Amino acid sequence: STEYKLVVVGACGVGKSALTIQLIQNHFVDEYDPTIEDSYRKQVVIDGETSLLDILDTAGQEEYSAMRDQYMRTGEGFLLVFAINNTKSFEDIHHYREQIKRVKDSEDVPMVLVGNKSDLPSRTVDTKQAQDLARSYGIPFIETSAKTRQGVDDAFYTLVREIRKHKEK
Ligand SMILES: CCC(=O)N1CCN(c2ncnc3cc(-c4c(C)ccc5[nH]ncc45)c(Cl)cc23)CC1
Ligand SMILES: Nc1nc2c(ncn2[C@@H]2O[C@H](COP(=O)(O)OP(=O)(O)O)[C@@H](O)[C@H]2O)c(=O)[nH]1
Ligand SMILES: [Mg+2]
């Protein structure tokens, strides 16, 4: 019934594709084409409501595009994905939030901070500083792992609930 247009952003290799494939198809991919930038549909039930999730898995190159601007303009919620073992990807989160705020012309955009690869032991980004950033953005923070599926459902579902609150707001 209700359609939700989600967009997954984040640096290369943080697990954007792997997180999306786990949600849609329930399996962890060891490798996925890092150039494929396409959207995926899936019908789910969230808080007792049939929701049609339309999830754009961003990839491609590091270039600006008026077409990519339309992607964020069409999107209703955004997953800010970084890898807990890649400090560079965590620093990139600011850039991705800035580019989304640039398009939608608003600081009130449904977003969720996603710390991926929580199964890995080589942690370089503290949970506290990830919570501190999400607090500063005023958005939820969820630690996920596309390998064990831990936190994957909670990541996308929280974004859907953020969109619902934004609609009432
Ligand atoms: C495997 C390689 C990989 O996963 N990539 C994914 C991230 N890509 C990006 N890198 C740097 N900045 C990027 C900026 C944008 C962007 C955003 C977030 C919002 C509006 C926009 N309008 N035009 C571009 C844009 C996007 Cl969609 C991707 C970026 C590199 C390849
Ligand atoms: N251990 C672990 N590895 C992951 C996880 N998510 C993704 N990966 C690995 O990270 C690599 C790149 O993931 P990918 O989905 O292509 O990231 P993307 O470029 O942002 O789309 C892949 O080889 C995956 O096996 C995770 O939650 N845990
Ligand atoms: Mg990918």
Is 101:137 a contact under the CB 8 Å cutoff? no
- Phi and psi for 41 in degrees, rounded to 5? -105, 150
Question: Could you tell me if 144 and 118 are in contact, meaning their C-beta atoms sit under 8 angstroms apart?
Answer: yes
Ligand at minimal distance from the CA of 13 is 2
Q: At what angle do helices 87-104 and 66-74 cross, to 10 degrees?
A: 80
93 CA to centre of ligand 3 in angstroms: 16
Q: How far is the CA of 147 from the centre of ligand 2 (A)?
A: 8
Q: Which of 20, 7, 38 is nearest to 109 (CA)?
A: 7
The neighbouring-strand residues paired with 40 are 55
Atom of ligand 1 nearest to the CA of 69: 22
Q: How many angstroms separate the CA atoms of 68 and 63, rounded?
A: 9
Contacts 24+ apart (CB under 8 A), 42-51: 46/157, 46/160, 46/161, 47/161, 49/1, 49/2, 50/1, 50/2, 51/1, 51/2, 51/3, 51/4, 51/160
Residue nearest to atom 9 of ligand 1 (CA): 62
Q: Which of 38, 76, 34, 77 is nearest to 57 (CA)?
A: 38
Residues contacting 147, CB < 8 A, separation 6+: 18, 28, 117, 119
Domain boundaries, the chain: 2-168
107, 101 contact by CB (below 8 A): yes
Rg from Cα positions in the chain: 15
Pseudo-torsion of CA 144, 148, 150, 154, nearest 10°?
80
Tokens at residue 102, please? 């640039």
Cα–Cα distances in Å, from 5 out to 8, 47, 127, 139? 10, 18, 28, 18
Ligand nearest to the CA of 92: 1
Residues at CB less than 6 angstroms from ligand 1: 9, 12, 34, 58-62, 64-65, 68-69, 72, 96, 99-100, 103
- Separation CA 85–CA 167 (nearest Å): 35
Method of structure determination: X-ray
CATH architecture for residues 2-168 = 3-Layer(aba) Sandwich (3.40)
Three-state DSSP at 47 gives coil
Is residue 85 within 8 Å of residue 123, measured between CB atoms?
A: yes
Resolution (A): 2.2
